[PDB]
Scaffold this active site. Sequence first.
Site, PDB file in Angstrom:
ATOM      1  N   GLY A  11       6.147   1.213   0.596  1.00  0.00           N
ATOM      2  CA  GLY A  11       5.179   1.578  -0.425  1.00  0.00           C
ATOM      3  C   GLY A  11       4.194   2.610   0.083  1.00  0.00           C
ATOM      4  O   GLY A  11       2.986   2.424  -0.030  1.00  0.00           O
ATOM      5  N   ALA A  12       4.712   3.711   0.622  1.00  0.00           N
ATOM      6  CA  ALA A  12       3.869   4.764   1.183  1.00  0.00           C
ATOM      7  C   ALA A  12       3.612   5.979   0.279  1.00  0.00           C
ATOM      8  O   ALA A  12       3.295   7.057   0.770  1.00  0.00           O
ATOM      9  CB  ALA A  12       4.467   5.230   2.513  1.00  0.00           C
ATOM     10  N   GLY A  52       8.844  12.670   9.807  1.00  0.00           N
ATOM     11  CA  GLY A  52       9.416  11.498   9.175  1.00  0.00           C
ATOM     12  C   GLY A  52      10.269  11.767   7.954  1.00  0.00           C
ATOM     13  O   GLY A  52      10.737  12.883   7.739  1.00  0.00           O
ATOM     14  N   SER A 137      -4.926  -9.304   1.700  1.00  0.00           N
ATOM     15  CA  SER A 137      -6.038  -9.033   0.798  1.00  0.00           C
ATOM     16  C   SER A 137      -7.091 -10.103   0.942  1.00  0.00           C
ATOM     17  O   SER A 137      -6.772 -11.254   1.250  1.00  0.00           O
ATOM     18  CB  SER A 137      -5.565  -8.998  -0.658  1.00  0.00           C
ATOM     19  N   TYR A 150      -1.197 -13.660  -7.108  1.00  0.00           N
ATOM     20  CA  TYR A 150      -1.470 -12.674  -6.067  1.00  0.00           C
ATOM     21  C   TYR A 150      -2.041 -13.378  -4.828  1.00  0.00           C
ATOM     22  O   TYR A 150      -1.646 -13.091  -3.700  1.00  0.00           O
ATOM     23  CB  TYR A 150      -2.466 -11.642  -6.616  1.00  0.00           C
ATOM     24  N   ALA A 151      -2.962 -14.310  -5.053  1.00  0.00           N
ATOM     25  CA  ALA A 151      -3.591 -15.061  -3.972  1.00  0.00           C
ATOM     26  C   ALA A 151      -2.582 -15.945  -3.231  1.00  0.00           C
ATOM     27  O   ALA A 151      -2.654 -16.092  -2.007  1.00  0.00           O
ATOM     28  CB  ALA A 151      -4.705 -15.907  -4.524  1.00  0.00           C
ATOM     29  N   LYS A 154      -0.561 -13.582  -1.052  1.00  0.00           N
ATOM     30  CA  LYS A 154      -1.376 -13.028   0.024  1.00  0.00           C
ATOM     31  C   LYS A 154      -1.771 -14.072   1.060  1.00  0.00           C
ATOM     32  O   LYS A 154      -1.899 -13.758   2.241  1.00  0.00           O
ATOM     33  CB  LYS A 154      -2.619 -12.338  -0.543  1.00  0.00           C
TER      34      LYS A 154
HETATM   35  N1  LIG Z   1      -6.333  -1.220  -3.678  1.00  0.00           N
HETATM   36  C1  LIG Z   1      -7.006  -2.209  -3.159  1.00  0.00           C
HETATM   37  O1  LIG Z   1      -8.205  -2.331  -3.312  1.00  0.00           O
HETATM   38  C2  LIG Z   1      -6.316  -3.287  -2.319  1.00  0.00           C
HETATM   39  C3  LIG Z   1      -7.123  -4.378  -1.759  1.00  0.00           C
HETATM   40  C4  LIG Z   1      -6.472  -5.373  -0.982  1.00  0.00           C
HETATM   41  C5  LIG Z   1      -5.072  -5.327  -0.743  1.00  0.00           C
HETATM   42  N2  LIG Z   1      -4.331  -4.251  -1.307  1.00  0.00           N
HETATM   43  C6  LIG Z   1      -2.891  -4.334  -0.975  1.00  0.00           C
HETATM   44  O2  LIG Z   1      -2.599  -3.020  -0.397  1.00  0.00           O
HETATM   45  C7  LIG Z   1      -1.239  -2.649  -0.710  1.00  0.00           C
HETATM   46  C8  LIG Z   1      -1.239  -1.281  -1.378  1.00  0.00           C
HETATM   47  O3  LIG Z   1      -1.185  -1.470  -2.835  1.00  0.00           O
HETATM   48  P1  LIG Z   1      -2.157  -0.652  -3.783  1.00  0.00           P
HETATM   49  O4  LIG Z   1      -2.289  -1.401  -5.040  1.00  0.00           O
HETATM   50  O5  LIG Z   1      -3.418  -0.259  -3.113  1.00  0.00           O
HETATM   51  O6  LIG Z   1      -1.352   0.688  -4.010  1.00  0.00           O
HETATM   52  P2  LIG Z   1      -0.304   1.148  -5.099  1.00  0.00           P
HETATM   53  O7  LIG Z   1      -0.625   2.611  -5.299  1.00  0.00           O
HETATM   54  O8  LIG Z   1      -0.221   0.171  -6.119  1.00  0.00           O
HETATM   55  O9  LIG Z   1       1.046   1.169  -4.243  1.00  0.00           O
HETATM   56  C9  LIG Z   1       1.970   0.047  -4.276  1.00  0.00           C
HETATM   57  C10 LIG Z   1       3.140   0.628  -3.423  1.00  0.00           C
HETATM   58  O10 LIG Z   1       4.199  -0.434  -3.338  1.00  0.00           O
HETATM   59  C11 LIG Z   1       5.449   0.023  -3.814  1.00  0.00           C
HETATM   60  N3  LIG Z   1       6.194  -0.998  -4.546  1.00  0.00           N
HETATM   61  C12 LIG Z   1       5.913  -1.689  -5.710  1.00  0.00           C
HETATM   62  N4  LIG Z   1       6.852  -2.548  -6.074  1.00  0.00           N
HETATM   63  C13 LIG Z   1       7.815  -2.408  -5.076  1.00  0.00           C
HETATM   64  C14 LIG Z   1       9.058  -3.058  -4.911  1.00  0.00           C
HETATM   65  N5  LIG Z   1       9.606  -3.992  -5.717  1.00  0.00           N
HETATM   66  N6  LIG Z   1       9.820  -2.703  -3.789  1.00  0.00           N
HETATM   67  C15 LIG Z   1       9.357  -1.740  -2.876  1.00  0.00           C
HETATM   68  N7  LIG Z   1       8.141  -1.084  -3.017  1.00  0.00           N
HETATM   69  C16 LIG Z   1       7.405  -1.451  -4.130  1.00  0.00           C
HETATM   70  C17 LIG Z   1       5.072   1.190  -4.769  1.00  0.00           C
HETATM   71  O11 LIG Z   1       6.176   2.059  -4.997  1.00  0.00           O
HETATM   72  P3  LIG Z   1       6.110   3.350  -6.010  1.00  0.00           P
HETATM   73  O12 LIG Z   1       5.227   4.406  -5.332  1.00  0.00           O
HETATM   74  O13 LIG Z   1       7.543   3.737  -6.079  1.00  0.00           O
HETATM   75  O14 LIG Z   1       5.485   2.865  -7.297  1.00  0.00           O
HETATM   76  C18 LIG Z   1       3.878   1.823  -4.072  1.00  0.00           C
HETATM   77  O15 LIG Z   1       4.237   2.705  -3.007  1.00  0.00           O
HETATM   78  C19 LIG Z   1      -0.682  -3.846  -1.563  1.00  0.00           C
HETATM   79  O16 LIG Z   1       0.106  -4.732  -0.745  1.00  0.00           O
HETATM   80  C20 LIG Z   1      -1.944  -4.489  -2.105  1.00  0.00           C
HETATM   81  O17 LIG Z   1      -1.767  -5.843  -2.475  1.00  0.00           O
HETATM   82  C21 LIG Z   1      -4.933  -3.217  -2.100  1.00  0.00           C
HETATM   83 CA   LIG Z   2      11.484  15.003   7.583  1.00  0.00          CA
END
Ligand SMILES: NC(=O)c1ccc[n+]([C@@H]2O[C@H](COP(=O)([O-])OP(=O)(O)OC[C@H]3O[C@@H](n4cnc5c(N)ncnc54)[C@H](OP(=O)(O)O)[C@@H]3O)[C@@H](O)[C@H]2O)c1
Ligand SMILES: [Ca+2]
Lengths: 241, 243, 243, 243
Positions: A11-12, A52, A137, A150-151, A154
């Site tokens: 998920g990068a 990469g 989280s 979600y909790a 996590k």
């Molecule tokens: N944002 C915050 O404040 C916050 C706080 C605490 C924890 N987090 C955690 O940090 C991480 C980043 O998430 P985010 O919400 O910040 O960013 P996001 O932009 O929602 O990114 C989620 C990433 O996960 C990938 N993904 C989703 N479903 C998938 C699946 N079935 N298989 C493989 N990859 C999948 C997405 O792919 P696509 O790019 O193809 O959509 C995307 O690259 C998560 O684990 C989240 O729970 C975020």
């Molecule tokens: Ca490359």
Amino acid sequence: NFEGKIALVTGASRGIGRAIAETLAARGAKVIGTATSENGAQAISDYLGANGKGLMLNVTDPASIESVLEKIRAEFGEVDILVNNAGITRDNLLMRMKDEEWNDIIETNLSSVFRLSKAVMRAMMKKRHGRIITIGSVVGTMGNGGQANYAAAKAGLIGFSKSLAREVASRGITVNVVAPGFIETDMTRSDDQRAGILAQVPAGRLGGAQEIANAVAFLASDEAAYITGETLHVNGGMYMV
Amino acid sequence: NFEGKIALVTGASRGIGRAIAETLAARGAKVIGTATSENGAQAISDYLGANGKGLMLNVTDPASIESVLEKIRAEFGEVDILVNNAGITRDNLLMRMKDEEWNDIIETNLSSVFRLSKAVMRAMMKKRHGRIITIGSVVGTMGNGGQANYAAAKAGLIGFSKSLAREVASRGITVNVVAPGFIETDMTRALSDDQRAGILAQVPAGRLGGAQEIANAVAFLASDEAAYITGETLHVNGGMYMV
Amino acid sequence: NFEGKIALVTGASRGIGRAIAETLAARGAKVIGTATSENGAQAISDYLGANGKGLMLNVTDPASIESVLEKIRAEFGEVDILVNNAGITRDNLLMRMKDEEWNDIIETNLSSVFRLSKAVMRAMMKKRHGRIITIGSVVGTMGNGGQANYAAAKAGLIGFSKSLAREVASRGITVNVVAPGFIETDMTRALSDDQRAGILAQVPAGRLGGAQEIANAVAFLASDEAAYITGETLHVNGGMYMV
Amino acid sequence: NFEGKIALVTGASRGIGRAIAETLAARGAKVIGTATSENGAQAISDYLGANGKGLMLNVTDPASIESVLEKIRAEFGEVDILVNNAGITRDNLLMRMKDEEWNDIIETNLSSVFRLSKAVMRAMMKKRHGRIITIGSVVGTMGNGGQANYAAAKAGLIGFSKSLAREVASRGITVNVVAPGFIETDMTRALSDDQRAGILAQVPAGRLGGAQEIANAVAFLASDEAAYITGETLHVNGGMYMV
Ligand SMILES: NC(=O)c1ccc[n+]([C@@H]2O[C@H](COP(=O)([O-])OP(=O)(O)OC[C@H]3O[C@@H](n4cnc5c(N)ncnc54)[C@H](OP(=O)(O)O)[C@@H]3O)[C@@H](O)[C@H]2O)c1
Ligand SMILES: [Ca+2]
Ligand SMILES: NC(=O)c1ccc[n+]([C@@H]2O[C@H](COP(=O)([O-])OP(=O)(O)OC[C@H]3O[C@@H](n4cnc5c(N)ncnc54)[C@H](OP(=O)(O)O)[C@@H]3O)[C@@H](O)[C@H]2O)c1
Ligand SMILES: NC(=O)c1ccc[n+]([C@@H]2O[C@H](COP(=O)([O-])OP(=O)(O)OC[C@H]3O[C@@H](n4cnc5c(N)ncnc54)[C@H](OP(=O)(O)O)[C@@H]3O)[C@@H](O)[C@H]2O)c1
Ligand SMILES: NC(=O)c1ccc[n+]([C@@H]2O[C@H](COP(=O)([O-])OP(=O)(O)OC[C@H]3O[C@@H](n4cnc5c(N)ncnc54)[C@H](OP(=O)(O)O)[C@@H]3O)[C@@H](O)[C@H]2O)c1
Ligand SMILES: [Ca+2]
Ligand SMILES: [Ca+2]
Ligand SMILES: [Ca+2]
Ligand SMILES: [Ca+2]
Ligand SMILES: [Ca+2]
Ligand SMILES: [Ca+2]
Ligand SMILES: [Ca+2]
């Protein structure tokens, strides 16, 4: 410096995931970032450039995980650093939570950690060195109304990480969790809702994606070889344990 | 990079304390390490060279604390990074533990954190930036027979750190704790293979931790890359305990 | 005293589950205990007598859950106390753990808590009162080699419970977890003295806990004397782990 | 039922302390509650009647301790249940906290636990049974701005309790902590509606806790139903904090 290390970051595409991928690459690692689509993968390949590659991966699909790893082994080699960042949310008060909202969260946010870890474990054990870091989280520790699913995932990945950590610690492998608080993301980016959030943070601000990436990079380095089964909270004081 | 930052590391004669002082210095910070004697202070001044100075400090004596700080201000300036590493042990089963054994541990391992944090706090608030890092112990979290006094102090400094963290978080100041598990020291180095085995058995990693490993964690939290981390306890114990 | 209360205890065939069912019944509650088979369900009806009934329930099958709740409502009424005790283990080091061993533990030990809680919640919200208690495990907090799946589930149910507790606290409903350490069961009883010694060495108390001891803790949290306790984990492990 | 047991409850003049004393007495135990003055001690003797006695005690004076336990042994016998409830607050942001305020809190809220636990220890081990319960606070786990001293003592007593629990677990003695959240007291009752609103907003339960609720938790841990619980912290805060 990660010169000679191969890192897999799920998920990068953006935010935390991208910051992590760029940071490890900037420090010498060969990075493979993933997205759920071919275009999303290509975009990752585009920014990582010569450091990469981007690959399409579905962490809920056994065949996908196996396919991606073989590709990585054929072009780069065995994964030394695994960063489980892939994740989603499906909020709802319990009574309104659909069975699918629960299952999709468990599979994508928890079972994925199990699947990816098992898939890279073998090579790490043989090499007697490795790093597994999962992005948790603050919700996993304090819980949150409307996010019981979600909790659960996590909090679940912490119990998993502790157990796995106990299984591979003697072989120079560490398993940890970085638990972000509120991180400034496209989503949080109109102004009575941001303040409802800031009010819960002593630091008085949202965290930056790069801040989570710095913590991940620290744990992934040789400077954190004695840290394992640990949860590093990066939440500006939102929660304290 | 700590260029321009002034760091005070208490109890920097050897082991963890010295590793911390050398690491911050190696990364650009002007370091003041302390010892309980003038000779110990000189030895610190010796290894720090042009990157710092050693000073005699007793963390249980207010006069010593204020005097030391007055000196640092004169030669270098206000402290930006405070590392509370000074600490001791006076082990004994509770039924045998003397009042002095309890008191000395409380004053040296807990009250010292209060005194030194309060002594560098004002300047930090004004700059709207600072770092306070205290070296705790896995014992403060899991407890340990024979170390009820040590455990109370190590657990207590966490409650203190969390409270202080909340008071100064808005001012760009973080207050954290690094809790080492079993770290190699002169004491452990001289243990017998039979006893070391008893220690290693409690550690999944299968080895003792290095003083430098604790120093690396401290340096991370002290850097600008850890501005969003506060009121947190970073455990560095090889899996000996997990929370 | 639970007179006037209806309690549902999943997996009440024996050990902890049975002790819980018998204890709540002995204190005035109308108890419905469950098993995965009709025979198991019958053994439960056998020991509950006029104070309850045994029903066949499969926590991983929505159909079964609905069927069971429908039966309790028909014969007894709405559930006031839910004790999630059903669970299993599928131990193995990660590299030997089959997908199904992971999936089954997650569905049986974690998703089951979600499903059952959601099925008794409405009525609790209306009555403005209720108790949901899930039997976790020390393993959920400390983790354990060979039980990553079990650990993930037991830790996850805590995360779930904290979140649910936040949603229903204002309505007189508490959601807690009782985390047993090593508890004596037919399995442990069959162990040789040498085998038991490996377990006993991990427990400061020097003995395995009694299923009745877990039941007493559950009964306390289920009573009106614990109305201000919610989102909490009560560890009952003889000092095996301390948080 | 605590018939035959002797319990010592420090600071039993009112609130939590009194509720604890009355509850243990109501359940059969001979209770000795304490206050800092002769009058407060008499008031306690007045409400305990034939089920106990009030004694003047200063948990900071070793001579007072020996003396009080001396009278207790003469009239009733050895203490079976020790409840460390005595405690005070000296709020202030660190930048303005006086040494006396820090030292007073540490001595009265932390060192007191060491002194009293050590004093009743021998008798318990000899009899292979005992209970030590200390009243902590949610502030000890979450910390609180303006209470760095109160938080250090409250967190410190858990570290202490875990260590002692480890030393005496094999002897049938448990050492635990009950950590109250906001409990309704005369102080909270005098707050304005605006202030109370500030507090309530922090409690999912939507109300302050009652003294009797803390007493019920203490009584549970003090009973024979909690023999497998030790080195544990039971949070009773209405969801204010969840760990
Ligand atoms: N944002 C915050 O404040 C916050 C706080 C605490 C924890 N987090 C955690 O940090 C991480 C980043 O998430 P985010 O919400 O910040 O960013 P996001 O932009 O929602 O990114 C989620 C990433 O996960 C990938 N993904 C989703 N479903 C998938 C699946 N079935 N298989 C493989 N990859 C999948 C997405 O792919 P696509 O790019 O193809 O959509 C995307 O690259 C998560 O684990 C989240 O729970 C975020
Ligand atoms: Ca490359
Ligand atoms: N070693 C481990 O495994 C381990 C594990 C967890 C935590 N720790 C913690 O790490 C820190 C390092 O201690 P250590 O035992 O490893 O090293 P140590 O070699 O015992 O060093 C203790 C240091 O503290 C100083 N000190 C002692 N009393 C003092 C006082 N009253 N005022 C000012 N300074 C005083 C000493 O000064 P002199 O040099 O003048 O004697 C010395 O520099 C302690 O806080 C300890 O609790 C150690
Ligand atoms: N024993 C210990 O030391 C210990 C320590 C910590 C936590 N625990 C936890 O305590 C609880 C009791 O388990 P145990 O191992 O001690 O006892 P156990 O004898 O294994 O009982 C497990 C119970 O769960 C029921 N069950 C299994 N799969 C089910 C399913 N799919 N749907 C509905 N019910 C199902 C069983 O039904 P049948 O009777 O029909 O087989 C049985 O009544 C578990 O949640 C366990 O994780 C035990
Ligand atoms: N109220 C809450 O919300 C709350 C929340 C969490 C924890 N607590 C804890 O619960 C306990 C009860 O305190 P409280 O504030 O609620 O009640 P309180 O009415 O303040 O009672 C304090 C009690 O401690 C005694 N005491 C004070 N200094 C003493 C000393 N040096 N030696 C011996 N006894 C001494 C007092 O004696 P006199 O009667 O002679 O003055 C009194 O009986 C404390 O440990 C407190 O930290 C309270
Ligand atoms: Ca919320
Ligand atoms: Ca020990
Ligand atoms: Ca941590
Ligand atoms: Ca019938
Ligand atoms: Ca094990
Ligand atoms: Ca607890
Ligand atoms: Ca506050």
